[PDB]
C-alpha cells in the first residue's frame, strides 16, 4: 500500500511516499527516484514502519 522513503543525503534531505503492493516494487520506485536524484547511499529497510531509508 503506502510505502515511505526517507532520504538523508548530504545535499538532499526529504521524504516521499508511493502506492505499491510489493516491497520490491516500492524499492524499485524509490531506488529509481533516488538514483535519478543523485543518490546511490546506505539503504536500510524499516519494515515495521513500511519505510526505506537512504543514508548518504
Find out whether 17 and 4 touch, Cβ atoms under 8 Å.
yes
> Distance of CA 29 to CAs 17, 18, 51, Å?
10, 8, 13
Experimental technique, in short, is: NMR
Find out whether 3 and 26 touch, Cβ atoms under 8 Å.
yes
For 53, the grid coordinates are 531509508
Q: Do β-strands 13-19 and 42-46 pair in parallel, antiparallel, or remain unpaired? A: unpaired
Identify the helix (H) or strand (E) that includes residue 5. strand 2-8
Q: Which domains does the chain have, with CATH numbers?
A: 2-55 (3.10.20.10)
Q: What whole-number distance in Å separates Cα of residue 41 and Cα of residue 13?
A: 12
Q: What whole-number distance in Å separates Cα of residue 29 and Cα of residue 53?
A: 13
Find out whether 54 and 43 touch, Cβ atoms under 8 Å.
yes
Amino acid at each position: 500500500m503506502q510505502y515511505k522513503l526517507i532520504l538523508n543525503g548530504k545535499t538532499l534531505k526529504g521524504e516521499t511516499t508511493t502506492e505499491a503492493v510489493d516491497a520490491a516494487t516500492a524499492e524499485k520506485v524509490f531506488k529509481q527516484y533516488a538514483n535519478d536524484n543523485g543518490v546511490x547511499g546506505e539503504w536500510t529497510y524499516d519494515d515495521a514502519t513500511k519505510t526505506f531509508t537512504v543514508t548518504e
